Design an enzyme around this catalytic site. Sequence first.
Site, PDB file in Angstrom:
ATOM      1  N   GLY A 258       0.775  -1.244   0.000  1.00  8.94           N
ATOM      2  CA  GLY A 258       0.000   0.000   0.000  1.00  8.94           C
ATOM      3  C   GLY A 258       0.796   1.278   0.000  1.00  8.94           C
TER       4      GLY A 258
ATOM      5  N   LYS B 163       0.494   2.531  -4.424  1.00 11.53           N
ATOM      6  CA  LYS B 163       0.134   3.892  -4.770  1.00 11.53           C
ATOM      7  C   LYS B 163       0.594   4.335  -6.157  1.00 11.53           C
ATOM      8  CE  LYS B 163      -2.013   5.557  -1.013  1.00 11.53           C
ATOM      9  NZ  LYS B 163      -2.375   4.189  -0.544  1.00 11.53           N
TER      10      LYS B 163
ATOM     11  N   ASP C 148      -7.956   7.128   0.617  1.00  7.61           N
ATOM     12  CA  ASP C 148      -6.916   7.695   1.488  1.00  7.61           C
ATOM     13  C   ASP C 148      -6.106   8.695   0.702  1.00  7.61           C
ATOM     14  OD1 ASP C 148      -6.084   5.235   0.038  1.00  7.61           O
ATOM     15  OD2 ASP C 148      -4.216   5.271   1.166  1.00  7.61           O
ATOM     16  N   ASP C 149      -5.611   9.713   1.389  1.00  6.52           N
ATOM     17  CA  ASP C 149      -4.659  10.697   0.837  1.00  6.52           C
ATOM     18  C   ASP C 149      -5.171  11.442  -0.412  1.00  6.52           C
ATOM     19  OD1 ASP C 149      -3.065   9.745   2.958  1.00  6.52           O
ATOM     20  OD2 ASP C 149      -1.395   9.142   1.659  1.00  6.52           O
TER      21      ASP C 149
ATOM     22  N   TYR D  83      -8.990   8.114   7.909  1.00  5.38           N
ATOM     23  CA  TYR D  83      -8.620   6.720   8.176  1.00  5.38           C
ATOM     24  C   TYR D  83      -7.857   6.474   9.450  1.00  5.38           C
ATOM     25  CZ  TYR D  83      -4.180   8.075   5.821  1.00  5.38           C
ATOM     26  OH  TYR D  83      -3.039   8.705   5.403  1.00  5.38           O
TER      27      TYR D  83
ATOM     28  N   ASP E 210       8.198   4.521   3.495  1.00  4.30           N
ATOM     29  CA  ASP E 210       8.169   5.423   2.328  1.00  4.30           C
ATOM     30  C   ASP E 210       8.262   6.887   2.693  1.00  4.30           C
ATOM     31  OD1 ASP E 210       5.575   5.420   3.371  1.00  4.30           O
ATOM     32  OD2 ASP E 210       4.546   4.901   1.473  1.00  4.30           O
TER      33      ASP E 210
ATOM     34  N   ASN F  72       1.318  -2.745   6.074  1.00  4.34           N
ATOM     35  CA  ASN F  72       1.888  -1.999   4.929  1.00  4.34           C
ATOM     36  C   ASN F  72       3.342  -1.762   5.332  1.00  4.34           C
ATOM     37  OD1 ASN F  72       1.802  -0.400   2.488  1.00  4.34           O
ATOM     38  ND2 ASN F  72       1.746   1.475   3.777  1.00  4.34           N
TER      39      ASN F  72
HETATM   40  C1  LIG Z   1      -4.067   3.916   4.905  1.00  2.94           C
HETATM   41  N1  LIG Z   1      -3.451   4.845   3.973  1.00  2.94           N
HETATM   42  C2  LIG Z   1      -2.310   5.477   4.240  1.00  2.94           C
HETATM   43  O1  LIG Z   1      -1.703   5.343   5.302  1.00  2.94           O
HETATM   44  C3  LIG Z   1      -1.789   6.400   3.160  1.00  2.94           C
HETATM   45  C4  LIG Z   1      -0.255   6.457   3.062  1.00  2.94           C
HETATM   46  C5  LIG Z   1       0.401   5.301   2.285  1.00  2.94           C
HETATM   47  O2  LIG Z   1      -0.354   4.099   2.345  1.00  2.94           O
HETATM   48  C6  LIG Z   1       1.766   5.188   2.980  1.00  2.94           C
HETATM   49  O3  LIG Z   1       2.472   3.980   2.734  1.00  2.94           O
HETATM   50  C7  LIG Z   1       1.364   5.315   4.453  1.00  2.94           C
HETATM   51  C8  LIG Z   1       2.566   5.411   5.388  1.00  2.94           C
HETATM   52  O4  LIG Z   1       3.561   6.307   4.909  1.00  2.94           O
HETATM   53  N2  LIG Z   1       0.442   6.488   4.388  1.00  2.94           N
HETATM   54  C9  LIG Z   1       1.074   7.792   4.677  1.00  2.94           C
HETATM   55  C10 LIG Z   1       0.080   8.938   4.784  1.00  2.94           C
HETATM   56  C11 LIG Z   1       0.656  10.259   5.218  1.00  2.94           C
HETATM   57  C12 LIG Z   1       1.529  10.957   4.203  1.00  2.94           C
HETATM   58  C13 LIG Z   1       1.046  11.278   2.940  1.00  2.94           C
HETATM   59  C14 LIG Z   1       1.850  11.931   2.019  1.00  2.94           C
HETATM   60  C15 LIG Z   1       3.152  12.284   2.347  1.00  2.94           C
HETATM   61  C16 LIG Z   1       3.652  11.978   3.605  1.00  2.94           C
HETATM   62  C17 LIG Z   1       5.060  12.372   3.979  1.00  2.94           C
HETATM   63  F1  LIG Z   1       5.206  13.691   4.158  1.00  2.94           F
HETATM   64  F2  LIG Z   1       5.489  11.811   5.107  1.00  2.94           F
HETATM   65  F3  LIG Z   1       5.973  12.043   3.063  1.00  2.94           F
HETATM   66  C18 LIG Z   1       2.837  11.321   4.519  1.00  2.94           C
END
Ligand SMILES: CNC(=O)C[C@@H]1[C@H](O)[C@H](O)[C@@H](CO)N1CCCc1cccc(C(F)(F)F)c1
Lengths: 448, 448
Positions: free
Chosen positions: A9, A40, A116-117, A161, A227, A255
């Site tokens: 994910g 993604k 999400d996002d 979420y 990530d 994930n």
């Molecule tokens: C259930 N869905 C999610 O959790 C969505 C995402 C992806 O799945 C990702 O793998 C996971 C952990 O990183 N999530 C990060 C979300 C926060 C974010 C967004 C953009 C940019 C950033 C950053 F600034 F940190 F880069 C963080």
Amino acid sequence: RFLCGVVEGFYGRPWVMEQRKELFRRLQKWELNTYLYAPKDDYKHRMFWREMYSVEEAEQLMTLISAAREYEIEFIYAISPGLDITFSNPKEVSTLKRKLDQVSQFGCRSFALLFDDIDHNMCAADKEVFSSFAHAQVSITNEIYQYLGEPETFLFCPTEYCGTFCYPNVSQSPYLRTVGEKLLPGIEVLWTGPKVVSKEIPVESIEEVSKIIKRAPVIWDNIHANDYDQKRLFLGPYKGRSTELIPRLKGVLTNPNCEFEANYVAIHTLATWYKSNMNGVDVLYSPQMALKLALTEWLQEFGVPHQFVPGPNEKPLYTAEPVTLEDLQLLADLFYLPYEHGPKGAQMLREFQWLRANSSVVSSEKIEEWRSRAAKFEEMCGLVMGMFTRLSNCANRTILYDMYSYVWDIKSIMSMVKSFVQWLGCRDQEPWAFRGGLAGEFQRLLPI
Amino acid sequence: RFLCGVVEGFYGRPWVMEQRKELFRRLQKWELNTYLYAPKDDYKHRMFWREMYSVEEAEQLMTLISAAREYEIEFIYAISPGLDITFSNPKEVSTLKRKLDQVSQFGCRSFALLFDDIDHNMCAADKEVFSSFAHAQVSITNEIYQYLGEPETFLFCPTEYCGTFCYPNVSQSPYLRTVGEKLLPGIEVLWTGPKVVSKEIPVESIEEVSKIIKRAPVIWDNIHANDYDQKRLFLGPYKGRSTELIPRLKGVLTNPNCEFEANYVAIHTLATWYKSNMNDVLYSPQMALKLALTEWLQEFGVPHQFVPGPNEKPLYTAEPVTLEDLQLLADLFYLPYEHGPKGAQMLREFQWLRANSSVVSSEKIEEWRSRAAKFEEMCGLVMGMFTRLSNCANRTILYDMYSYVWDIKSIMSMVKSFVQWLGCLIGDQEPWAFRGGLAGEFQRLLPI
Ligand SMILES: CNC(=O)C[C@@H]1[C@H](O)[C@H](O)[C@@H](CO)N1CCCc1cccc(C(F)(F)F)c1
Ligand SMILES: CNC(=O)C[C@@H]1[C@H](O)[C@H](O)[C@@H](CO)N1CCCc1cccc(C(F)(F)F)c1
């Protein structure tokens, strides 16, 4: 019936087909049962969600889905249309249906829509048809769910979420209230805990969210995701989730790190956690004991790919010593968990902070405290270099390459730290003296 | 007759065969002529240099060597035995000979022995046979060279391969003196300049070293190498080496970024530099960057409809990558000793906004607010650049760069957010607030 396994994910380079098939084999070996396809940046999952798979791509997904069934792993096909779907245009809904039905013709029976996002703002045309963003999502999710024949497993990732994403909080969110009321009861909802990367997922946090979504959630766990920060890797054990959650959840899908082979501990310890209280309603899961189990098993993979014996006076082989369990324990402690370093890592940091802060003492009993503490610290920096050297000689090149950047970075920095302690004990640079890029120059001016 | 092209000479994940073949095609397209095989961590090149290639590996190298001849690129097979070789054991010399003649049976006619990045200490048995480390290296290099029939192209990388590595300096080094005197004149010597990563390679530096090795060197150029720092990438132009070097050199082989697709500018600008004075008014690094970037752009829209109305959700994917995006990207990830103009500009503006921020809470307020809004616009261009890259059709290029572009956009997003906060940030944070891992906590305690 509990969905436990892995969601692919994350952002960045997705896993390739060979790796996904190998995942299924590991999931089965560890008595996990689920894989959720959601990379993604796999272009036809999110960005170009409208585009049907080609004959080539179709053949590859069919082969993958067959491999899942062969390994008794439920395959869940997610799609992420939220960046640009006009929810109220029925051609758009038809396009979404077409896409998912193409995948169902590949043999897939389980599905997911993810929101999400994405931002909460709808286009004008959707504002006139739906009274809120949640109504719009729930409407197409329900319509797609029934169009596919109410499949036994269908998942929904909300836009809110996690605890912190809920406006104004979990229990009064008009987004989640609508999801709980209107989303059809057969559909499962994904949830990452109080935060995106939850340090802990307390039972009462899940009681709170379960009440408002009106089902037990499936956890989408970001504990081992890496990530978000280029320098990070997580090899610590699954931690901060009580085994008492299992009865209050429909599943946990982790994930994990982008680098496929780095996920041995992440997934193995998840399996150990699930297996410990599989049929629950006296401590069943120990994160340390689970780490050790995972690492002991992982070790066997390092000596498998994916003579001359020098005399007493001759140059000894550089390559002679294999990776040890103790090397992997050290490595995991250096790249442990998002909110915690492992004991050996925290110990080295503490000893260095102390040696730096008391360094004026060179130039008393305090000198021999400093010198003996320093020599013991240099020994530990030597163990990090030893760990790197033996990794770099291992027969499993595939595991080496996935980890290379990380182990090279840590050994390289420990080498500068060691060198600096030696300099403290004795009273035109290359670019690696001054590390991080432009990014690093910006970062150093922000508050820490 | 000048060797110009690329050495795959770096640490970490080597390039795979498909990428090497693609390299040959690009080298030919840009009228370069040489490839030097030397991946530090390709196991049978260095660590296990003794081991013969298998039937499978042999077939792959044969295919690669054929591809080189087909693209009019000279293939040079390097081996790195220095970690482990007992120089005086003739079985060890025989093992080396066996290995190299296996490769010559693959069609290869050009070779190299490399002694970079090993320590100067010989085993007891070698100390009794050879009076110095250089004598030992020169002895087997000469013996191998003649055993192979004095091939037209045979290279030697010294242990003292740059100005700073020469003990006590270049002109009095007993290591290099011996290399110059004893190494057979048909053998070429590799040299990285005054430093490992040379900011500049002045003419007189090469006159100095040429005198002591008694030939013109082949430069092994690390200008664009990025294995030494996990966060770094170099997309700036070939710079700091006068076109006047070309007559005083036998070649330039560039050792560029680990990520294959990131080397379009590195190799293209090298070619433009060579072509400018094949037989500094002739070469402009800026003009060359622009040429390279304009050409690179065409690759982004090639892999490796729906039209929304005025009231509907506009496509997320509509805008393609622009030349201006790549110019910005290159300026953010430019050269080891220098950021590109736009990068340096953003850093300067942020330093100023941070240092004059007390001015919120005069003409100075409207200087601050107007400078801030203009800086936020620029941070938005970085996010725009990321978003359009992430939608491009060439997924292979995207994935090689992903970590870097994601990091910079992610940090610019925090910097933007921070400037907005100054014009009006902690608690229970997500892990990406506090960046860099254990490594980063050590790094922040070293002097900067
Ligand atoms: C259930 N869905 C999610 O959790 C969505 C995402 C992806 O799945 C990702 O793998 C996971 C952990 O990183 N999530 C990060 C979300 C926060 C974010 C967004 C953009 C940019 C950033 C950053 F600034 F940190 F880069 C963080
Ligand atoms: C002609 N041969 C060379 O230049 C040898 C190497 C590799 O080819 C590498 O690609 C290139 C640029 O990085 N060189 C760096 C050497 C300094 C070093 C060594 C170990 C570790 C480090 C580090 F800790 F800084 F990373 C540096």
